[PDB]
């Protein structure tokens, strides 16, 4: 579990020198964009369950053979696997957005997902489409201004689109 701060700390520990001035200048900018980071993370967990069901319908339409019999997500028990576990991507993504680093995302939700499926028979490609259907809606939920002050966070939202693309490409 690493931060943006402890990323710089563990990197400066390996060289064994003091923290340089521009690194403190860069981390002072993260303090200024710190309140926008709580704007984006609070907006996802408020719309957490609404974006799980909405991305599930768009997945199970466009691959109909899954909930069809013989499919990997056919029975009601497995189905509650491939639906409730779509939160677990979002659980570890919004951890990484609030952390600002992809270390927590890597060793919990990324380290064995492409591992565990060969023994399970779950198709890797189907999951990728699913997380990639979360990404265009999770970015779109945090994009629109309604009752918040207007700001610019395109340099910060691209981190969120990178986090889903890190989660997608490591499996499929």
């Amino acid at each position: 579990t690493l931060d943006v701060f402890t990323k710089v700390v563990s990197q400066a520990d390996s060289r064994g020198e003091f923290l340089s001035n521009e690194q403190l200048d860069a981390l002072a900018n993260v303090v200024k964009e710190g309140n926008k980071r709580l704007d984006v993370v609070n907006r996802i967990t408020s719309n957490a369950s609404a974006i799980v069901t909405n991305a599930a319908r768009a997945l199970f339409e466009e691959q109909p053979q899954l909930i069809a019999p013989g499919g990997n997500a056919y029975t009601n028990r497995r189905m509650a696997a491939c639906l409730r576990d779509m939160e677990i991507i979002l659980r570890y993504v919004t951890y990484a957005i609030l952390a600002g680093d992809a270390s927590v995302l890597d060793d919990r939700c990324l380290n064995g997902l492409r591992e565990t499926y060969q023994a399970l028979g779950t198709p890797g490609s189907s999951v990728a489409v699913g997380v990639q259907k979360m990404k265009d809606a999770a970015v779109g939920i945090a994009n629109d201004p309604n009752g918040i002050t207007k700001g610019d966070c395109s340099q910060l939202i691209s981190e969120v689109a990178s986090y889903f693309d890190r989660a997608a490409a490591a499996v499929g």
Binding site: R77, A81, D85, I88, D107, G112, E115
Partner: protein, 213 residues
Amino acid sequence: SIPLLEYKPSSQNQRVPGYEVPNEDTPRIYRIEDAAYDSELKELIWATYRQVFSEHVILKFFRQGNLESQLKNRAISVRDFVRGLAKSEAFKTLVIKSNSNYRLVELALKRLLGRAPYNKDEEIAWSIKIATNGWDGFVDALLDSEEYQSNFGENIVPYQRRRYKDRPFNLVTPRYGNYWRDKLESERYIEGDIKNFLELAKSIEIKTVTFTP
């Protein structure tokens, strides 16, 4: 003393919730407080032997009379009872003479915690503690772990948590390791060899004379 080596956890069938509501091929995970009888406690005392040693090593000589008596009395909690079998020198000769340190991590997680190890780097992580704390001290740190005490609870026999399509662990892991087997082939006593006559051949003195013409 020193905090443990930091290990990454992999994806594992018990690490998450799974929505199985009681399936049949799942264990009968026993409790001490149900019993109220002579009868129930003989079956419960047998399933904990079946977990920690294994079925094959469940012979009467190994079994401890004092420990069995305690469960009936109820003086000792089943979680305090498993400490008897893990720190039993009848158990210790069977598994600690024959298994390395990293296998000793894996066998204790596989039986007592009833879980597969996550990775390789965490058997390395638990390894330092065992050498310093002893075998008893590593077992003591495993049973007083927060993970063991919350999920098994206080009085429930060890078992495997989630095995939707997973090998039984007794079958999956041998009592002893692949290393100690190779010693048994090395000390097989081959018959009719040149090697056992090598220590006799050097004791015999031979003088050789060569003539050149």
